[PDB]
Amino acid sequence: LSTAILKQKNRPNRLIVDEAINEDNSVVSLSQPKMDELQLFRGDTVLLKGKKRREAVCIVLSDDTCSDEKIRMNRVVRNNLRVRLGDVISIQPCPDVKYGKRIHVLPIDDTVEGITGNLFEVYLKPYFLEAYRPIRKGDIFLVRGGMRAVEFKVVETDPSPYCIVAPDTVIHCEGEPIKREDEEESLNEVGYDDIGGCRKQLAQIKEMVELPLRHPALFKEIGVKPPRGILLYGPPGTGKTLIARAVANETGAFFFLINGPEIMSKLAGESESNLRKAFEEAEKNAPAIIFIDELDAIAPKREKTHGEVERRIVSQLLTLMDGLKQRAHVIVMAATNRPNSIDPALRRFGRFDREVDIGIPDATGRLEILQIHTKNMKLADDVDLEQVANETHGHVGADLAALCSEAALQAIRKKMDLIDLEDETIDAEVMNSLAVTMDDFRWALSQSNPS
Amino acid sequence: LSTAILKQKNRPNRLIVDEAINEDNSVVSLSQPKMDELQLFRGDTVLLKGKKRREAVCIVLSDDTCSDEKIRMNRVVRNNLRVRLGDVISIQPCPDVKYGKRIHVLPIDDTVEGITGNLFEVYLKPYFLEAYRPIRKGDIFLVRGGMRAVEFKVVETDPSPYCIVAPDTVIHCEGEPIKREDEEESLNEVGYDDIGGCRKQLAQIKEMVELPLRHPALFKEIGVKPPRGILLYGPPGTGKTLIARAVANETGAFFFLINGPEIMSKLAGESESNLRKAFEEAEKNAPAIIFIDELDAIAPKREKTHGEVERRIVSQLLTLMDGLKQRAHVIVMAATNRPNSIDPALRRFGRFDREVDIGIPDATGRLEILQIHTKNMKLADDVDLEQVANETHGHVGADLAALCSEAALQAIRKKMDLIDLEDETIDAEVMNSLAVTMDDFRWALSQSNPS
Numbered sequence: 001l002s003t004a005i006l007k008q009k010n011r012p013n014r015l016i017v018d019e020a021i022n023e024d025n026s027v028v029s030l031s032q033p034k035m036d037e038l039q040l041f042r043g044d045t046v047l048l049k050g051k052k053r054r055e056a057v058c059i060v061l062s063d064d065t066c067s068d069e070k071i072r073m074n075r076v077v078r079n080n081l082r083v084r085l086g087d088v089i090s091i092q093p094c095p096d097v098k099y100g101k102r103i104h105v106l107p108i109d110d111t112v113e114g115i116t117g118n119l120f121e122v123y124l125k126p127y128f129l130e131a132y133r134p135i136r137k138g139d140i141f142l143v144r145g146g147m148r149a150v151e152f153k154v155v156e157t158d159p160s161p162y163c164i165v166a167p168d169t170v171i172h173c174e175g176e177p178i179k180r181e182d183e184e185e186s187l188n189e190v191g192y193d194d195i196g197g198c199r200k201q202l203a204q205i206k207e208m209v210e211l212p213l214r215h216p217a218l219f220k221e222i223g224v225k226p227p228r229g230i231l232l233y234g235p236p237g238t239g240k241t242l243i244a245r246a247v248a249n250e251t252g253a254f255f256f257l258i259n260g261p262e263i264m265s266k267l268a269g270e271s272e273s274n275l276r277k278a279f280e281e282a283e284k285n286a287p288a289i290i291f292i293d294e295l296d297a298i299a300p301k302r303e304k305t306h307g308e309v310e311r312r313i314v315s316q317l318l319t320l321m322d323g324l325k326q327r328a329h330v331i332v333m334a335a336t337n338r339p340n341s342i343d344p345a346l347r348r349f350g351r352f353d354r355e356v357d358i359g360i361p362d363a364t365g366r367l368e369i370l371q372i373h374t375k376n377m378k379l380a381d382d383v384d385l386e387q388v389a390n391e392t393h394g395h396v397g398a399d400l401a402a403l404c405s406e407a408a409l410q411a412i413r414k415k416m417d418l419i420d421l422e423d424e425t426i427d428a429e430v431m432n433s434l435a436v437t438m439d440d441f442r443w444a445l446s447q448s449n450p451s
Numbered sequence: 452l453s454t455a456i457l458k459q460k461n462r463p464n465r466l467i468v469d470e471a472i473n474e475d476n477s478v479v480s481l482s483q484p485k486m487d488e489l490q491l492f493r494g495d496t497v498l499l500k501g502k503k504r505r506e507a508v509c510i511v512l513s514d515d516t517c518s519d520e521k522i523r524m525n526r527v528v529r530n531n532l533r534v535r536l537g538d539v540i541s542i543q544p545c546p547d548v549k550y551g552k553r554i555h556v557l558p559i560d561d562t563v564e565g566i567t568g569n570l571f572e573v574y575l576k577p578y579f580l581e582a583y584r585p586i587r588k589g590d591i592f593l594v595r596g597g598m599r600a601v602e603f604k605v606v607e608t609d610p611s612p613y614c615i616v617a618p619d620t621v622i623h624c625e626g627e628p629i630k631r632e633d634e635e636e637s638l639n640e641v642g643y644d645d646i647g648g649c650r651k652q653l654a655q656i657k658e659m660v661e662l663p664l665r666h667p668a669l670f671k672e673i674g675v676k677p678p679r680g681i682l683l684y685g686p687p688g689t690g691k692t693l694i695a696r697a698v699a700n701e702t703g704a705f706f707f708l709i710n711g712p713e714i715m716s717k718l719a720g721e722s723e724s725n726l727r728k729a730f731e732e733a734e735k736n737a738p739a740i741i742f743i744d745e746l747d748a749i750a751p752k753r754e755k756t757h758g759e760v761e762r763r764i765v766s767q768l769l770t771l772m773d774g775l776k777q778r779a780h781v782i783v784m785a786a787t788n789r790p791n792s793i794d795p796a797l798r799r800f801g802r803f804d805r806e807v808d809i810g811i812p813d814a815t816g817r818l819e820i821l822q823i824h825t826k827n828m829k830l831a832d833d834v835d836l837e838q839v840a841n842e843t844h845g846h847v848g849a850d851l852a853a854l855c856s857e858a859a860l861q862a863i864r865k866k867m868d869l870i871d872l873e874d875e876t877i878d879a880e881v882m883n884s885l886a887v888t889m890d891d892f893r894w895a896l897s898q899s900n901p902s
């Protein structure tokens with residue numbers, strides 16, 4: 001009703017992700033009745049939009065066994081789009097794709113332990129030979145070559161970001177293997193889905209940041225100026241910084257992050273350069289979102305603040321906030337857990353003149369969060385999160401995370417007589433037996449604390 | 452029950468140290484019934500793990516008189532392993548030992564006062580001749596040669612850290628004699644055993660620091676992220692720094708120490724370099740433990756702190772704490788006796804978000820400590836520590852240490868009419884007569900003070 005901006009719409013080309021029949025990386029299945037509706041001929045190269053602004057490039061074919069409003073893609077494709085089976089994507093005609101000049105691709109470290117021989121010969125040459133594949137920068141794809149299957153990451157393409165791999169395409173694969181861990185972190189980067197119990201506020205954010213930038217005309221037409229300063233506040237630990245993350249990954253804009261405590265670590269005047277440098281960068285690449293985390297760290301009350309360089313920064317900032325031209329297309333977001341200590345001049349109209357309170361979560365919010373956290377944890381069947389939710393009154397996001405971490409330990413703890421700290425490696429059986437029992441939670445619960 | 456991680460396990464090759472029958476440095480006794488269980492043939496060269504990460508290398512033989520789950524070793528071996536008779540060790544097959552290229556060994560100063568003649572000839576040559584001994588770097592071993600017995604320290608081996616001494620091995624013993632005192636300090640280096648009345652906390656430390664680093668997979672498997680900031684706090688003098696010591700010596704990890712008061716003694720900016728330098732060192736050598744002693748000295752409340760360079764450091768640190776990547780494998784530990792004066796931003800989730808309170812010890816704790824202290828003191832038989840323990844209410848670790856030091860003096864005091872300060876040397880008889888009577892304690896006790 002007021003959460004309207006969130007419920008996404010039934011549209012011609014929003015299709016649910018079904019498991020693939022055809023097993024090929026560059027292939028996507030569609031019902032014939034659909035392919036026509038979207039004016040899509042066979043072997044056409046298409047563009048796919050996923051989550052967290054991830055993109056994939058594929059070739060399209062008709063599947064008899066595929067529902068109209070469903071689409072098949074393998075796990076490699078589900079990965080680049082960052083979607084689980086049952087999620088929904090945008091399909092779009094990608095007609096002007098150019099042939100590939102040169103591509104640079106590296107293998108993942110934990111998929112090459114063993115023989116080198118020749119990676120191009122054994123793996124890449126055949127996978128690409130006479131295939132004419134579409135690929136995007138930052139695609140991770142798997143190639144089987146006789147005895148092994150190896151994962152490769154598309155480091156660079158000419159032309160960026162996408163090209164077709166033709167016979168003329170020079171393929172470079174020399175370099176240091178990509179580290180798995182980094183690419184683990186990359187998958188794990190926070191989306192909107194990863195924040196819980198903030199629907200109301202999430203709405204406002206999109207309404208004040210995402211919307212004014214994606215569709216500036218709605219405001220033009222109606223004849224009003226969008227606000228340009230948004231200040232999130234909340235009792236400590238409520239996913240303010242966490243939202244900072246989501247937006248960066250999720251937003252269509254050029255994003256620049258500023259960390260109060262990090263600014264203030266610089267030499268006198270070194271900070272003023274960085275402060276300008278940020279605002280200049282943002283203008284140069286507009287539309288942009290500048291985000292200031294822990295604002296209070298750089299904007300105490302000038303009157304009540306002791307150091308001299310210290311006031312200069314509040315002044316320095318104020319100036320920049322004000323120095324933003326209308327045509328600039330920059331929204332400054334920021335966040336504190338102590339709003340009242342921030343110099344009031346910054347909350348004057350035309351500066352940070354919009355607030356999003358990010359309060360304690362209620363019963364269902366806790367349940368939401370608990371779900372988001374445990375989504376990759378090993379839990380016993382006897383674990384009831386609704387219970388936890390109810391028993392966790394006054395917890396916030398960070399309190400809950402802690403709770404989970406604690407029970408997890410307690411679980412690990414129950415294996416601690418079976419294991420000695422000294423051992424070089426752990427008995428592989430027990431490892432698999434390990435799970436967080438509901439009892440583990442009740443222990444963690446018995447230990448919990450105020451926010 | 453929650454101290455589970457501490458109780459060590461019955462295992463195939465955890466054997467109790469029994470006094471040796473065979474008197475040789477390179478020899479270890481085992482029951483035949485055991486030797487088989489561990490697939491260990493006679494004259495095999497084995498690896499032995501002691502306390503505080505000490506290691507010894509020996510040759511193994513069967514003893515008829517030796518219990519299955521016991522092992523015999525002489526005092527020289529008990530010394531390199533840093534164990535008293537009745538302690539327990541790891542025995543491990545050491546199969547790939549290489550022959551010794553060159554070894555450098557020096558004698559101990561207070562074991563060579565007198566004739567030189569030739570140390571190699573009289574002592575080393577025979578002890579090694581046709582023996583094929585296993586030795587480790589940092590072994591101290593004793594050699595008898597006619598009239599005298601001399602102690603040698605293995606300064607360097609090629610290949611490090613262990614090699615077999617064959618006839619081909621070139622032996623260098625030229626140099627300045629090792630100073631006894633240094634090697635006294637070395638034996639005395641604080642282990643875990645040296646801290647008393649903290650079992651509960653000692654547990655949490657291992658649980659939070661040693662465990663996440665030694666076995667990162669338990670958390671991976673269960674799908675939780677270990678915490679990376681641990682803050683120890685306690686009323687002054689409760690072995691916070693003392694634990695700092697233990698961990699350094701005891702840990703598997705690369706360890707880097709930071710002393711608040713020592714950081715703050717540096718020129719402006721000269722501290723910031725060191726702070727980074729430390730965090731960089733730790734990343735470079737991960738897995739690592741960075742330890743910050745007297746944290747409050749560098750992290751007062753930014754709001755409540757006066758100097759400018761002074762806030763810059765709190766900011767500087769915060770940044771680094773945050774700048775720690777997931778893949779980094781670094782746990783930051785720190786300690787204060789004034790937790791409440793530390794800037795709260797540092798106790799936010801994902802920074803120092805775990806506390807270990809190191810509190811006053813109870814009756815038995817005191818008794819524990821009193822034992823640990825007096826372990827190398829000359830005490831009369833009439834001395835009842837249980838008494839002391841009961842009478843010392845409200846004392847902490849440092850209070851007790853003081854007490855002992857005070858009674859010791861009182862004891863020395865009782866010899867003070869027999870002795871004049873002026874004398875060049877002390878009557879050697881009285882020296883031996885000296886011991887701390889229980890009365891001495893009752894005096895010290897009568898003088899004691901609040902913490």
Ligand SMILES: Nc1ncnc2c1ncn2[C@@H]1O[C@H](COP(=O)(O)OP(=O)(O)OP(O)(O)=S)[C@@H](O)[C@H]1O
Nearest residue numbers: 195196236237238239240241242337397398401799
């Ligand atoms: N609303 C939420 N949904 C899901 N997880 C959350 C939420 N809030 C906090 N968390 C978890 O707790 C961690 C800390 O949250 P942050 O966003 O750093 O808190 P914060 O509100 O920025 O705290 P301050 O004000 O800087 S002390 C996050 O990394 C999440 O894992």
Ligand SMILES: Nc1ncnc2c1ncn2[C@@H]1O[C@H](COP(=O)(O)OP(=O)(O)OP(O)(O)=S)[C@@H](O)[C@H]1O
Nearest residue numbers: 646647687688689690691692693788820848849852
């Ligand atoms: N738990 C303990 N077990 C054994 N000895 C202790 C213990 N606590 C203190 N001591 C002795 O007292 C000395 C001082 O202890 P420290 O570890 O320096 O105290 P601390 O807790 O670091 O004090 P602060 O907070 O820096 S004033 C140590 O060197 C020990 O000899």
Ligand SMILES: [Mg+2]
Nearest residue numbers: 240241293294
């Ligand atoms: Mg934050």
Ligand SMILES: [Mg+2]
Nearest residue numbers: 691692744745
């Ligand atoms: Mg101390």
